[PDB]
């Protein structure tokens, strides 16, 4: 005997798409904190940058 599933010459295939990993659900819910702050508004956190251009 030989393995039932082999030798699919047809269907050349396609290049895999860029992987976009989903965030870890409640199972591995652990994630890095984005920054603690008072946040007396809708929420900004302790991380905010900006680029002053010309």
């Amino acid at each position: 005997c030989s393995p039932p599933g082999e030798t699919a010459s047809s269907e050349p295939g396609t290049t895999p798409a860029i992987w976009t990993g989903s965030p870890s659900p409640a199972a591995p819910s652990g994630e890095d904190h984005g920054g603690g702050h008072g946040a007396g508004a809708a929420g900004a956190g302790e991380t905010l940058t900006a680029e002053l251009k010309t």
Binding site: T15, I18, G30, E31, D32
Partner: protein
């Protein structure tokens, strides 16, 4: 009888990243792309260089190298009709030595491509090299010539 007409040693491609395209009178060797990528893709609009060596097989010559352009608009700066029983070295693969203080025809036929399409290392991208004798698709790879590892960020256990 590993020495018969089909022997392992003889039927071996060079251990180089560039592909070989023997189709046509002029043979293309070590044809690759120097496209240093800082992320998943080399974004369109950035110029990456096209390395290869065109060796002439016949002395009777095929020194035209008309267009050799594909998706990306490959342009041949300092183009010259070099191949006459010899080599046309378009660029300087990493580790290349100039071999003399001066130079001939300024750059030695440097081929550069404005991508107009994302590319990434590990993929094969078709290039149609067309000499007056004929045209051949080569399926050039992306090669990181001599650049060492780019430092990946340290991992924070979670």
């Amino acid at each position: 009888c590993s020495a018969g007409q089909i022997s392992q040693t003889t039927t071996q491609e060079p251990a180089v990243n560039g592909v070989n395209a023997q189709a046509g009178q002029v043979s293309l060797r070590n044809v690759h792309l120097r496209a240093p990528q800082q992320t998943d893709y080399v974004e369109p609009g950035t110029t990456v260089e096209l390395l290869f060596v065109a060796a002439n097989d016949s002395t009777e010559s095929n020194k035209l190298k008309s267009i050799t352009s594909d998706v990306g608009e490959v342009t041949l700066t300092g183009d010259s009709t070099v191949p006459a029983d010899g080599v046309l070295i378009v660029g300087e693969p990493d580790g290349q030595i100039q071999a003399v203080e001066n130079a001939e025809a300024a750059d030695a036929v440097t081929a550069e491509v404005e991508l107009t399409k994302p590319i990434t290392n590990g993929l094969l991208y078709d290039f149609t090299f067309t000499f007056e004798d004929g045209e051949t698709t080569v399926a050039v790879p992306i090669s990181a010539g001599e650049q060492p590892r780019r430092p990946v960020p340290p991992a924070g256990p979670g």
